[PDB]
Design a protein around this ligand. Structure first.
Ligand SMILES: CN[C@@H]1CCc2c(ccc(O)c2O)[C@H]1O
Lengths: 281, 50, 233, 329
């Protein structure tokens, strides 16, 4: 009865992710006032989160509950590829949003000319192309398969389908997906915080007669506490460690999945988004 | 100056009962109601826009 | 036939391309509005910055455009300027004693109040310039026109220790100038919700570095607007 | 001095009170209500850069003209949604625009105090100057005469070839903000910030009647299709319908919810529906005889600035500060 009770959590998570992402996508799509340069990135992130929540969360939940994979081997490979593509696209879109924010704040005069609708579309296309490459190319070509006997036996078995990866591919996927975007986000957000502190000090000096810290803290926390443990356990069990149990790895991956139910409502907290949501519902 | 003359000219003007003008406007609205697609929406075939 | 439709589509495409080019050219141009009384000295500021009146001047390859509407007691065209990055307000701080009949400086303060508490422009910052600093210094040092006689608040006013004054070598002129600035700042702070800010600058007719001040201040205005849009201020 | 003016005001007030026998509400209370009206955006143009201020339907029920603070006067084909012409303006600000009944000429003007006129068969054929204040509205009496309303509290009747003010309609306190022309070219009225709308005769050049019902500035005026009445929008929430023959007010259109002013007012072809723009993001309709709102219209992203009903009565086009003209039907 434990799985029956546990299965409610996964269903609730999937429902919340789908509902939030659908609401956000409809919010940008229906109203023309919401469309903007950064809202294109926001809706791309919402689309990626919706795709992952629709595809990999229910299938992974079914695999966990039934303790077996009923579908075929090719469908399992497709599910793994979709999972990697969606995670990479979501984190890369977070990084691109952070870079856009940094460019808009630090370089305001050139911000209008630097990024346009065509530039945003090109950036989104490049992000999705690199995510699709890093996902499908090393997987569909079986470049991630391990030479261990356990991995070969797992691949041979039609029913059981777990994730077994090389050290090289695991390291490359980690650095491409999370670590480099983590460094870029930390750098740009540190610069943005420095600029905000300078502006606050100037305003206090001029009109002597914070919020930026809280916002950056919540953004960085909901990114790091959601993804970093999984992406350090990745490298840990890839490189010379056997203490990583499968349960811990799956739990951290599902925390990373839960991050998709947290990114929308924190990236659509603007008053215009609230008004659009109220009008829609 | 000329304001006194302007007001004096404005004061002397023929006026009709408000009821008569109200009835005239009502009659015009009733008579020309049919020839107006805003009051009664045009059929989709008849509508130039859609 | 369909030839007319094809020609119309081609013309529409050409017009759309021209409009896209115009949008690219125009989105990089920042609009500024020059507002002030006739005796304020807006001509001096215009001459200093350049070196309806439309003016092109660029700083660091950033194009700014400046407007000067130029009695018009009831300002009904003030709602037209809603997309400008900032509104330049020019007032002669040496015109406190001169009165037309209500001091001119008090009338300028009332005009600033009307501009600030305007429904149509509620995200438009104001760049404040106080020309005729030398004349104000001469008037204050002479003492012919008592500052407390026209402005009763000067009797209880004390100099701000926080703000370091310029080397004017006279405490009295610094006190007077800072009181005049603080009047505008007190008007601005009452309705200040963080959307728009007032930046006071002490300028002189001899001084010509007002263009860099305007450039830096507009940069700060855009930075603050973006920060508030992202909710970091 | 002022004693004669006070006596004249008392006399006209007494005459207006005597002529007010029964309000139009009393007569109209026995009419069938219009009922709910549903209006849908048949076509959205969406081709302007900055906020637009005024628009004018052509004599043909298709073509449009909309002018925006971006400085471009763009002609739009409503049916096809294609852009026929785009005429750049020398002045960065355009406060109004017009379409000649012949369709050959299009005139626009703004804070430049010059009523530029463009020939469509797009070069400036003539520029009319002489107004002390900013222009506010322009309409075409014929192919050769145009009446312009300026911020100098004076309206003038221009001649294109002559280029000089044929007649000046002086004698108004506040700055005129809008004017409308009668179905014939004989009469036209204007409304200013002095809370007064005055009727003018183009030939004589003297104000026949003056109506001062409102308590705030008038921003929009349109005629009843009959030509015997006209309704004026205002900065106050009330939109009122006047009467030339009765010389006095007939109705006020006020609702408790609406605290905003009025920007554009236009009647339907039959005159039953009074379309009024608002400082709020959405426009409202009014039963011109019942004074009861029939149905609120879908809002734009910003405040609406202009209303125009086709000569055939097919559709109404509203333009907001969101640079969008949404054709409604
Ligand atoms: C279904 N489990 C996958 C397997 C490995 C992996 C994940 C997410 C992001 C990556 O960059 C990965 O390499 C996990 O979600």
């Amino acid at each position: 009865v434990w799985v029956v009770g546990m299965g409610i959590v996964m269903s609730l998570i999937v429902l919340a992710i789908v509902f939030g992402n659908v609401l956000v996508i409809t919010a940008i799509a229906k109203f023309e006032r919401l469309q903007t340069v950064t809202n294109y990135f926001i809706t791309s992130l919402a689309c990626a989160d919706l795709v992952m929540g629709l595809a990999v969360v229910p299938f992974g939940a079914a695999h966990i509950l039934t303790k077996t994979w009923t579908f075929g081997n090719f469908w399992c490979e497709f599910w793994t590829s979709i999972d990697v593509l969606c995670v990479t696209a979501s984190i890369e879109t977070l990084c691109v949003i952070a870079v856009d924010r940094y460019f808009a704040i630090t370089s305001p005069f050139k911000y209008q000319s630097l990024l346009t609708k065509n530039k945003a579309r090109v950036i989104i296309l490049m992000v999705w192309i690199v995510s699709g490459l890093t996902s499908f190319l090393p997987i569909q070509m079986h470049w991630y398969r391990a030479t261990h006997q356990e991995a070969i036996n797992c691949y041979a078995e039609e029913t059981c389908c777990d994730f077994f990866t090389n050290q090289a591919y695991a390291i490359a996927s980690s650095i491409v997906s999370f670590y480099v975007p983590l460094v870029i986000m930390v750098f740009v957000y540190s610069r943005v915080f420095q600029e905000a502190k300078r502006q606050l000090q100037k305003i206090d000096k001029s009109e002597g007669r914070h919020k930026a810290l809280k916002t950056l803290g919540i953004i960085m926390g909901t990114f790091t506490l959601c993804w970093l443990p999984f992406f350090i356990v990745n490298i840990v069990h890839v490189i010379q460690d056997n203490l990583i149990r499968k349960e811990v790895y799956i739990l951290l991956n599902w925390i990373g999945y839960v991050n998709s139910g947290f990114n929308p409502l924190i990236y659509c907290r603007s008053p215009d988004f609230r008004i659009a949501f109220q009008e829609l519902l | 100056r000329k304001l006194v003359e302007q007001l004096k000219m404005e004061a002397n003007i023929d006026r009709i009962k408000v009821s008569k003008a109200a009835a005239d406007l009502m009659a015009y609205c009733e008579a020309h109601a049919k020839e107006d697609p805003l009051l009664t929406p045009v059929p989709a075939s008849e509508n130039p826009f859609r | 036939q369909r030839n007319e439709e094809k020609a119309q589509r081609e013309a529409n495409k050409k017009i759309e391309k021209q409009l896209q080019k115009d949008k690219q050219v125009y989105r990089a141009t920042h609009r500024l509005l020059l507002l002030g009384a006739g005796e304020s000295g807006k001509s001096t500021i215009v001459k200093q910055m350049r070196i309806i009146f439309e003016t092109k001047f660029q700083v660091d390859k950033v194009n700014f455009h400046m407007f000067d509407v130029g009695r018009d007691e009831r300002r009904k065209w003030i709602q037209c300027f809603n997309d400008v990055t900032a509104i330049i307000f020019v007032v002669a701080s040496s015109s406190y004693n001169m009165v037309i009949r209500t001091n001119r400086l008090q009338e300028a303060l009332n005009l600033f109040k009307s501009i600030w508490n305007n429904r149509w422009l509620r995200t438009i910052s104001v760049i404040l310039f106080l020309n005729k600093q030398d004349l104000l210094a001469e008037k204050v040092l002479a003492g012919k026109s008592k500052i407390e006689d026209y402005f009763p608040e000067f009797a209880r006013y004390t100099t701000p220790e926080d703000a370091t004054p310029e080397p004017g070598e006279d405490p009295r002129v610094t006190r007077a100038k800072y009181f005049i600035r603080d009047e505008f700042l007190r008007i601005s702070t009452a309705s200040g919700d963080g959307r728009h800010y007032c930046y006071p600058h002490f300028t002189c007719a001899v001084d010509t570095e007002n263009i860099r001040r305007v450039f830096n201040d507009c940069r700060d205005i855009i930075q603050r607007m973006h920060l508030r849009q992202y909710e970091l201020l | 001095l002022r004693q004669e003016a006070e006596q004249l005001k008392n006399q006209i007030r007494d005459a207006r009170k005597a002529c007010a026998d029964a309000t139009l509400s009393q007569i109209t209370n026995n009419i069938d209500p219009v009922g709910r009206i549903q209006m849908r955006t048949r076509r959205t143009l969406r081709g302007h850069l900055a906020k637009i201020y005024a628009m004018h339907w052509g004599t043909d029920s298709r073509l449009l003209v909309s002018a925006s603070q971006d400085g471009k006067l763009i002609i739009w084909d409503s049916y096809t949604t294609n852009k026929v012409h785009a005429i750049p303006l020398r002045s960065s600000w355009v406060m109004t625009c017009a379409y000649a009944p012949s369709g050959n000429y299009v005139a626009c003007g703004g804070l430049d105090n010059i009523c530029s006129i463009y020939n469509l068969k797009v070069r400036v054929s003539r520029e009319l100057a002489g107004h002390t204040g900013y222009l506010s509205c322009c309409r075409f009496l014929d192919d050769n005469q145009i009446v312009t309303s300026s911020g100098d509290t004076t309206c003038a009747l221009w001649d294109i070839e002559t280029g000089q003010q044929t007649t000046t309609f002086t004698g108004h306190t506040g700055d005129v903000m809008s004017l409308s022309l009668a179905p014939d070219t004989r009469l036209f009225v204007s409304g200013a910030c002095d809370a007064s709308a005055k009727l003018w005769d183009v030939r004589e050049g003297m104000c026949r009647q003056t109506f001062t019902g409102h308590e705030s500035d008038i921003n929009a005026i349109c005629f009843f299709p009959n030509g015997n009445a006209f309704a004026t929008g205002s900065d106050d929430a009330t939109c009122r319908l006047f009467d030339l023959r009765a010389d006095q007010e007939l109705m006020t259109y006020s609702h408790d919810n609406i605290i905003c002013g009025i920007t554009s007012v236009s009647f339907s072809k039959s005159g039953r529906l009074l379309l009024a723009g608002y400082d709020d993001f959405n426009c409202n309709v009014w039963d011109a005889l019942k004074a009861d709102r029939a149905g609120v219209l879908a809002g734009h992203d910003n405040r609406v600035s202009c209303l125009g009903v086709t000569d055939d009565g097919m559709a109404v086009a509203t333009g907001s500060w969101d640079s969008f003209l949404k054709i409604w039907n």
